[PDB]
Every structure is written in structure tokens, then in C-alpha cells.
Amino acid sequence: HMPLDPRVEQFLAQMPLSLAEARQQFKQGALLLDQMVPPPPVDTEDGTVVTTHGPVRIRRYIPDRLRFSHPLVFYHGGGFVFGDIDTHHGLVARLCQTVGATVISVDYSLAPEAKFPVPVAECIDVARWAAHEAPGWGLKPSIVVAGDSAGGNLAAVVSQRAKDESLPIAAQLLFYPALDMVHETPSKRDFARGYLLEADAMQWFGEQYLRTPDDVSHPWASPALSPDLTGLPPALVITAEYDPLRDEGEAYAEALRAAGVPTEQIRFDGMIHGFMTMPIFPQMEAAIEAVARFLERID
């Protein structure tokens, strides 16, 4: 156990209704963080992708200077219930400008209004769209999927489904993903209260997203359960030391490595879940630099 990062420690010490109110409170939090540490200017265009489960709003981010030859498709976190393209703008704008990549940020359908596995399907369909469009942006058709938390779950599942769905994926970027809804890990037991993402909330999220308790063992909910990880896309797996989801993330990175998948596994010490959408922490930019350096090695 390394000491908490000082800024994280202060943030947690200063920490202090309806579904709609809760969603609004989550959005207001993101806004305050962006007011504290403004995002870089970036050109964007909004659109909508026709998926097998309905229209899905997207936002395309165009870098000042294009330096990376694959589109990124980014799925935001928020427990499958909260978040949108605006809440994750601070992260995505930085990924775009720092990597020098076009990024497609995805506004997938939220639970409980949409249930598992609807967002998985949507996220596959958007990735497929991106692969098809890529040549017309002067890019390679293989995409890089990315996501934080619940979004990292989606990125991991899309990656596992990709060969079966004829979807070319060059890499997967998993930021403190949720990967195993079945097993308790030491981290999930020991950091379950007081570090922003809590047990009670994870349980509640599961109740909104899943159709029944049996869905926890479904491979499209718990990608960590998949016994054959050979041939999956190169993986960057970023974890936070004091995150209940830490151990499942690191174990999945170990499993990928042992299955011959090129894998970079980075734990940010003293950090908490969510830190890559919390620009008050310099570790957010360090992790984005890790993304750029990992992606340099893909081609």
C-alpha cells in the first residue's frame, strides 16, 4: 500500500433522489472539474450512427495535427447509468489533441431504460461504422477502442467480439475497467467504501443494467471470464491503486499477456477510480501520455 496521492487525499477529505437528479448531479460534477481545469480547444462534429438497436449519437474529434493512423472509438463510463459525451469531453479532447488522433465519442443507451446487452450491440455497431468510414478520413480501417470504467467493460467486450463480428481492431485501451461481475477480488473487498466508487453503487448499477442476476456470468457482461484470450487486440490496461476494480483489471492484463497479447499494464499508485476524467490530478495527463506512447508502438 503506497500513500494516497496528496491531491487525491484532499479531494476525498472535501467530499460531502431521483434517477434524473442523480444524472444531473453527475453532469454538474464533470462541469465543475472542467471549470477548474479547462479542456484544450478541439474541432468537433456531431452525428448519429444507425445501429441494430437504434440511432446512437456520436461526436467526432479532429486533432489540430493528425499523427495517428487509426480512428479511436471511445465509450464513456458512469456505471452504464450516468455519463454522456459532455461528461467525458475533458478526457476525449485531450486524447484527440495529445495522441493526434480522430476520436469518435459514443453516446450509447443508458440503463435502466436500455438493459444489457443493448449497449454492447450499439458499441459494436459504432465500431463497425468507424472501420468503414476510416479510409475516407485517410486512415487505416482497423480501429482502436477505448473506455473508462463501464466504458472499459464495453471496450473489452467489443474487443472479444471483434473477430466473430468481422471487425478489425488494432488495439484496446482499458482505463480502470469493470471486467468481472461474478468474483470478489481483494481490492473489491478492501476498497469498497470511501474511494468514490463504492460497493453499494456497483450493486445498484448492476440492478439497473442487468436483466436478471444470472447475467453476471454472461461473457458480454464479464469479459474476464473468457477462457481464450489468444489473438485479441494489443491492450493498454491502466488501473488505480485504490480502486475496487483494480485487481480484476490487473488480472485481466496478466491473462492477456500470458495469451500472447501485446499488453502494457500500468498501475497509477496513490490514485482512485475515475482519475482520468478528473483533470485536477496531473496523473490524468500522465495516463494520456501513456496512451500516446503505447499507440506509437502499434504501427
Ligand X SMILES: COC(=O)c1ccccc1C(=O)OC
Smallest separation, CB 201 to ligand X (Å): 7
> Distance between CA atoms of 17 and 7, rounded to whole angstroms?
29
Of all helices (H) and strands (E), which one includes residue 103? Answer: strand 103-107
Smallest separation, CB 70 to ligand X (Å): 26
Smallest separation, CB 133 to ligand X (Å): 29
Smallest separation, CB 245 to ligand X (Å): 6
Span 87-146, contacts to ligand X by CB under 6 A: none
Residues of the chain immediately before an interruption (C to N > 2.5 Å): 16
Span 48-87, contacts to ligand X by CB under 6 A: 79-80
Q: Which is nearer to ligand X, 270 or 279 (CB)?
A: 279
Helices and strands in the chain, H and E counts: 9, 8
Span 171-230, contacts to ligand X by CB under 6 A: 178, 180-181, 202, 205-206, 209
Residue partners of 189: CB distance under 8 A and separation at least 6: 244
Q: Binding string to ligand X for residues 15 to 54, with x set by CB under 6 A, is what?
A: -----------------x--xx------------------
User: Burial of 26 by CB count in 10 Å (0-12 exposed, 13-18 middle, 19+ buried)?
Assistant: middle
Q: Binding string to ligand X for residues 269 to 288, with x set by CB under 6 A, is what?
A: --------------------
Q: Which is nearer to ligand X, 2 or 36 (CB)?
A: 36
Active-site residue set = 149
Smallest separation, CB 152 to ligand X (Å): 8
Smallest separation, CB 219 to ligand X (Å): 14
> Distance between CA atoms of 71 and 295, rounded to whole angstroms?
11
Count of CB atoms situated within 10 Å of the CB of 2: 10
Q: Which is nearer to ligand X, 134 or 240 (CB)?
A: 240
Q: Which is nearer to ligand X, 58 or 245 (CB)?
A: 245
| Of residues 99, 109, 81, the one with CA closest to residue 19 | 81
Coarse DSSP helix, strand, coil percentages of the chain, rounded to the nearest 5 percent: 40, 20, 40
> Distance between CA atoms of 72 and 22, rounded to whole angstroms?
29
Alpha helices for the chain (secondary structure H): 6-13, 19-36, 89-99, 118-133, 150-161, 186-190, 199-209, 246-258, 282-296
Q: Which is nearer to ligand X, 13 or 45 (CB)?
A: 13
Asked if residue 254 lies in contact with residue 229, where contact means CB atoms within 8 angstroms, the answer is: no
Q: Which is nearer to ligand X, 31 or 292 (CB)?
A: 31
Count of CB atoms situated within 10 Å of the CB of 64: 12
Chain positions contacting ligand X, by CB under 6 A: 32, 35-36, 79-80, 149-150, 178, 180-181, 202, 205-206, 209, 245
